[PDB]
Structure formats: structure tokens, C-alpha cells
Structure 1
């Protein structure tokens, strides 16, 4: 986990995008690629299409997701089973 004194990390393009979203009050799927950003309270309720390699998986941010990072919710390998 990142050091505490540094504060939580987030990409500035994602920051500007989510500010634009919350000021437009529009439910558009926010496409992104930053699986390293940390989910912020200002994103609760937003539908973020985050990258996983192949394509963009849509995640709906809930009150609980405020700690994790978008990579937690974009799974990146596909495993069905061995038989």
C-alpha cells in the first residue's frame, strides 16, 4: 500500500473526467485505462468502463468501493477450468 503521507494516487486525466461527470450530472459510461487510480468518494454512483487488457469492463462504483483501485474490479485473466 502506498505510503500514507503521500496521499492516495489518481491520474489527473481521470480526475478532470470525473469532475466533469459530477458537474454535468450525466450517467455516461466513463471509459478509462488507469487501473492504478484509487476510487474516490466523488465517484460513487458512476459507471466506469476500465481496461483489462482485451477491452473495457464496466464497473458501477458503490459506497463500498471507496478504498480499492480500479484494477481490483477489472479482472485481467480468463480462467474457466481445466476440464
Structure 2
């Protein structure tokens, strides 16, 4: 497995949208490119609309999902199935 070594992460990038969102508890999907950012306790119950390079995907953030980054729930690649080829991308 891989990690974040030793220094302190909230993500610098995500921080300025989040600090105003936690003040409300949760508010409308935070337009986010910051797919580089991990999930944490402060973030439980937010809604992060997560750019995947093509478009945003809402990730509803919750306690069972704190072992993960935001970038994992929103897909990137397409996989050609092999009964017959894959027609669509899947969200």
C-alpha cells in the first residue's frame, strides 16, 4: 500500500470551499477539481461535486467512506467488455 508519508493533509486546495461549508454543516455541491484530496472526519456529511477531467460527479461524504480519496468514487477510464464491446461510460 501507498500513503501520504508524514506531513499534514486536509488539502490546501479544498480548504477555502470547505471552511465556509462546515459553517452551515452542508450546503450546495462544492465545485471541486481537487481529486488529489483525501476524505477526513471534518468532511463527514458534505457534498463534493468532483471533476474527473470530463465533468463533475457528486460524492456524498460519509463515515463509511473515510478510508478513501474523492477521486476513487468518481470514475476516469472506460473498460471494453468482452461478450461484445462497451457502448457507454458509467456513472
Q: Please state whether the residue corresponding to 2:20 is helix, strand or coil.
A: helix
Structure 1 residues without counterparts, runs of 5 or longer: none
Relative to structure 1, the CA distance from residue 63 to residue 30 in structure 2 (aligned partners, 3 Å threshold; closer, same or farther) is: same
Q: Which has the larger radius of gyration?
A: 2
TM-score, reference length from structure 2: 0.73
Structure 2 residues without counterparts, runs of 5 or longer: 83-91
TM-score, reference length from structure 1: 0.79
Cα offset for 1:80? 5.9
The 8 Å contact of residues 45 and 60 in structure 2, kept in 1 or not, is answered as yes
Cα offset for 1:13? 2.8
**1:3-57 deviation line (CA, Å, top 9, x unaligned):** 5652453431311211110013342101101111111111111111101121001
Match of 1:60 in 2: 60
Which structure has more relative contact order (CA 8 Å, sep 6+)? It is 1
Structure 1 window deviating more from structure 2 (72-81 vs 62-71): it is 72-81
Relative to structure 1, the CA distance from residue 24 to residue 73 in structure 2 (aligned partners, 3 Å threshold; closer, same or farther) is: same
Query: May I ask how many residue pairs the two structures share in their alignment?
Result: 82
| Greater helix fraction, Structure 1 or Structure 2 | 1
Cα offset for 1:67? 2.0
